[PDB]
Structure 1
Amino acid sequence: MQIFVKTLTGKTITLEVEPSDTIENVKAKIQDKEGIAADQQRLIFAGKQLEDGRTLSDYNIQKESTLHLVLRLR
């Protein structure tokens, strides 16, 4: 499926993922796309904070869903 990731700079990233791809897998893809370390990434979907070890389907994230990227710089 295809999902979108909106960032703090206003950009919209398009990613190709499988239903069971983990949040950590998605962060790795975002790191390649935007050059933002995966360990500093925090994703949100429908007001839910997404956990690294869970999958997209675990959060009912479907085709064309929009996720938000926020950061943790410590």
Structure 2
Amino acid sequence: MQIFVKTLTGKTITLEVEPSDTIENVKAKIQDKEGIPPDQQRLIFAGKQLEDGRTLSDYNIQKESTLHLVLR
């Protein structure tokens, strides 16, 4: 399952995830591509900021959904 993460600079990165992944997993995957430590990452989907312990399926995030990255 592929999703997109958009940064404030406007670039889009692609992530390979599963519905079971937590938001904390996703921040780790963003770390691996961008080098941004997870504790500086805020993730937003559908106008709401996502919580570390919850899962992608908890937020109805599905393939080709777009998450938005805003740094602390």
Unpaired segments ≥5 residues, structure 1: none
Q: Give RMSD over aligned pairs.
A: 1.1
Q: Provide the rounded CA distance (Å) in 1 between the counterparts of 2:34 and 2:47.
A: 23
Give per-residue Cα distances to partners, 1:4-51, cap 9 Å, x unaligned: 000011110100000010000000000110111100000000011100
Q: Provide the rounded CA distance (Å) in 1 between the counterparts of 2:34 and 2:11.
A: 10
Unpaired segments ≥5 residues, structure 2: none
Number of the residue aligned with 2:6? 6
Percent identity, aligned pairs only?
A: 97
The Cα shift of 1:67 comes to 0.4
Matches within 5 A, 1:16-27: 16-27=16-27
Q: TM-score, normalised by structure 2?
A: 0.95
Number of the residue aligned with 1:28? 28
In the TM superposition, structure 1's runs of 4+ consecutive aligned residues that sit over 4 Å from their partners are none
SS in 2 for 1:39: helix
Task: Name the count of aligned residue pairs.
Answer: 72
Q: TM-score, normalised by structure 1?
A: 0.93
